[PDB]
Amino acid sequence: VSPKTRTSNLKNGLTIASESNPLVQTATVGVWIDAGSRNENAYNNGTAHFFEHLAFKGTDKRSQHQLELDIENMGGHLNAYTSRESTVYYAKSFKDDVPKSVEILADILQHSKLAESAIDREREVITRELEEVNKQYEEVVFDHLHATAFMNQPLGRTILGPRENIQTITNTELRKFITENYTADRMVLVGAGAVDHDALVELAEKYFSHLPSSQSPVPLGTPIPNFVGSEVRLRDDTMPVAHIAIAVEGVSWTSEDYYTALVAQAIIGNYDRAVGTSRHQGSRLSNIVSENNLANSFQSFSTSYSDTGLWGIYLTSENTTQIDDLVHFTLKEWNRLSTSVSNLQVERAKSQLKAGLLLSLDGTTYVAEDIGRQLTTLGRRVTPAEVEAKLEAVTEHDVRAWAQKTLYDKDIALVGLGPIEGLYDYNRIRNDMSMMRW
Template identity: 45%
Template structure:
């Protein structure tokens, strides 16, 4: 016998343990079993199903507490057996100088190479014996150290993270060993064309500012970074008010605050001299071309200046980004893809793939499309992209906007599947917004009007693509192409201001700055 309790109802079902003979089973019994199973399925669906609105409102709440030293503690308790606990630091390559570019990423590599309390071997053995996973990464604005572990081992995870932040030794031998590792990593990154294109995109779109620098730093800096540079960067940027201790999983907020007080109360709160500040950022509409005949395709990024994390225009831009979508020639949709741009480029053989992107920083961003295409087809593909942008500004329908909203909701909820992405979302939002935006609030922001999307698109000059308006476009449009065996020639007329004609041949590198 099998007992199932559903609310106040007790349902008893018989489980057959021996093979029934066919001649002994009547049609009436079979019919009764089918009806019973259908009725049971109907009851289960009513008992366990929630509407979308009810589900997002009932999601676990994110609690935030600021400790006495300025450290912010944020957690979401879902009651699970595993948890992700990490420290998000408001420090990345954007806070570096030309001389120190690469130090933040170098520190990430040195994090697990030993502390005053644990050697590298002791640290690795402790993490492995816990069955945990310890990792770190660096971006242009943030540095992150986090651990995935059983909820019962939360205290040991916080202890290890605090030990790394407060007591790392940065031994000379480890520094030299990691120097070689980073140089090899740079060689691998140079083989990833998308990484290369986006580094070039930042270097020319934000030229002369801190966002133009790469995360890994130049080779010369990697070869010359010393222990004093690492210690100086930690003292200047690893401050409690610039950190967030975040957790997602089964750790309660009270427990996390208690662990923060026990292990992270000694984090420094101030730095001698001037407090580190985020340098201003300036967008420069420009074009950069690099030719390499050995490449099989042209890799390009076409982008305009977008907005920062907390700008209300960010959500409409995300919807527009979703409408453009992504496409690859291996996709089976062909010319029946939901993206209009995919339907257009899918007819020809020139475009290999494209992917829309919306990269946000604190006070600015980049919104555009990454393209891989044959060299002779890149101009046509870029023209299709510009036409799609113009379509979004002038002709998009309510049905298309609604589809973009729903797809954006789906994508964002899928990205929050698991304790690690939830923890990352908590840490990032606390640093960017100063709070964790509830899912139901985010859903309400997505549910913007059709007119709002159009007004945001037009305010960014996304529709200026042809004729005498081409020069206006270059003030907000940034293009980067890596071309293969391609002779480039741009020429456009600008009324009484005369014409501009630029030819790029051989190995010329041309930048158009307006």
């Protein structure tokens, strides 16, 4: 039984949340913000990601070089990432270097220069990033997947933004973005590892007390997405591996079906020919795929947002003449979540998940990421006892009912990249979303 997550607020409405571990000697402190690319419009799309670059380009006190030196002298590192709904800025350090790291984070968030010279310099760096994501096939597939599933909607936009915006982003719009979005009621200061909660609250009172509050404070993790059944094909005969994602509209963080969708996802599970144990997994799809050499890997996913989600599978295969079989067998395993699953699969998946949700948190950065994610999506850290109860409440009837309303005979978003000549047209893929025998 893990130590209790302590939570305090400041007057502005900044949440401080901590989980101490007296067995480690490092600490991860950082700021989780309930804001990301989705908060941009079409004209300033790319701003949030642009700011992330400039946050490390110098503040009103420390220059770019001084910033570098200060962190080098601390001994640990700083890291940041911007997603569609969430931005994170954290610092991993030694136990007693925590006050330094909180001070640096407070500086780069509140007091960043955003100097025209630096805007202009990064504008090329970010332009080069547009032509090099092209290599990260999983990311290419998932970005096209969001773009098509949420066609012409904010969740459909990329994080980098269009080339056009990169050339026209000004310090004015950068400043406007972080003034509107980086408000105290949207921010959580998180500490995990060798942190004292009371010490962290004091550091918050010292550095984050002059943060603006938003005019209308909504609760943390407050949001209408209209999913489009659709396909993007990026055929490239020169690539040896096909990458395919298939998804349906999934569940939000606060859906009542959140755990049901996780259990369903665990019934299909993951597979990777490179891992020794994968040929012995219990999942039916795993057995079909491994026996017939249909794929190098597959990974089931259930991505959530504040008001929607995507539930589906990502496949990679070199078997270019049997892509049809791979997709066919995958979707017939999904059909069985509607028609055939019983207590046998459901209780097996529950067993696997009860551990999986706890195992994931195996270092201070993972713990901080868990506290930060849960605080910015649900408004609270959910105790493992509550999570164990919600998983236990999932029955086979719940899984069947969920799959019959979410998967069965529903539109999919489909992205294929690589040698995908063998991937059939939309109708034949979508026809596998039901079974004529049932």
